[PDB]
Amino acid sequence: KSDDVNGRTKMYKNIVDGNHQMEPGMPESFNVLLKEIRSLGINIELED
């Protein structure tokens, strides 16, 4: 029920098909935050 665009349609199709399985993805608000931090002279990145 959040900004995960790829997750919303997936969950809707799952409910239509009665899957009831949750696929996380990763919220776009975090992407916005990362871009905003990078807009400053600040280095930030997500490792593995």
Partner: protein
């Protein structure tokens, strides 16, 4: 400027700067912008200052000598270990938002 009787980092007002340039000639280089801070910060040895601070803290012990020095030592150590260039603090290029 070491030949000049001027410190490495001392404030020299506009008239003072002018007369100093007049009498010392073009020896004691000085600037008034962020270029000055960039040059001063990039021209130094972190290890030498850290060693000198450690020696000073070990030798001179006082209520004020104990403080205002250990924090500087920790800052120098963090900068050395993090590998971050101090000159990077003086930003040059500007990223913008999407």
């Amino acid at each position: 400027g070491g030949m000049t009787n001027l410190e490495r980092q001392q404030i020299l007002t506009e008239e003072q700067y002018l007369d100093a340039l007049e009498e010392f000639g073009d020896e004691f280089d000085a600037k008034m912008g962020a270029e000055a801070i960039q040059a001063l910060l990039k021209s130094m040895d972190l290890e030498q200052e850290c060693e000198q601070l450690r020696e000073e803290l070990n030798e001179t012990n006082s209520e004020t000598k104990r403080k205002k020095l250990t924090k500087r030592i920790k800052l120098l150590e963090a900068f050395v270990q993090s590998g971050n260039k101090p000159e990077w603090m003086i930003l040059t290029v500007l990223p913008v938002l999407p």
